[PDB]
Design an enzyme around this catalytic site. Structure first.
Site, PDB file in Angstrom:
ATOM      1  N   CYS A  40     -55.528   8.874  32.577  1.00  0.00           N
ATOM      2  CA  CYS A  40     -56.333   9.965  32.038  1.00  0.00           C
ATOM      3  C   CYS A  40     -55.469  10.931  31.234  1.00  0.00           C
ATOM      4  O   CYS A  40     -55.722  11.171  30.054  1.00  0.00           O
ATOM      5  CB  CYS A  40     -57.036  10.713  33.171  1.00  0.00           C
ATOM      6  N   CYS A  43     -51.863   8.328  30.262  1.00  0.00           N
ATOM      7  CA  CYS A  43     -52.424   7.115  29.679  1.00  0.00           C
ATOM      8  C   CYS A  43     -53.029   7.400  28.309  1.00  0.00           C
ATOM      9  O   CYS A  43     -52.978   6.562  27.408  1.00  0.00           O
ATOM     10  CB  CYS A  43     -53.486   6.523  30.607  1.00  0.00           C
TER      11      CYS A  43
END
Length: 115
Positions: A40, A43
């Site tokens: 989140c 990434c």
């Protein structure tokens, strides 16, 4: 009792620990595992930079990921102090290791340069 499945088709997928020896070990290809958050924050930044190397590399390799938040024991187990950590495996064995949220270029160098 259903045996056949349609999940394998899925490209990027997280490989469990029990199945690891069944997938990674079994397979004779370079398994790219990444030990970071639940995908989140980091990434999002290491999303494209990672896809690049993959696009140039090939369309056969596999990219595995694991949420440290959920699997914290796995982190320390493989010496993981930073969130953006990655380990380039090959045939069920850690042949290379790269850590750090950098562009595709740099991230790519950390591998070859390390090799």
């Amino acid at each position: 009792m259903a045996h056949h499945h349609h999940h394998h088709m899925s490209g990027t997928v997280t490989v469990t620990d029990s199945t690891f020896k069944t997938d990674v070990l079994d397979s004779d290809t370079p398994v790219l595992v990444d030990f970071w958050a639940d995908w989140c924050g980091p990434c999002k930044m290491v999303a494209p930079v990672l896809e690049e190397i993959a696009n140039e590399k090939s369309g056969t390799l596999k990219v595995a990921k694991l949420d440290v938040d959920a699997n914290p024991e796995a982190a320390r187990d493989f010496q993981v102090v930073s969130i953006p950590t990655m380990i380039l495996f090959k045939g069920g064995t850690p042949v290379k290791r790269i850590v750090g949220a950098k562009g595709k270029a740099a991230l790519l160098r950390e591998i070859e340069d390390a090799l």
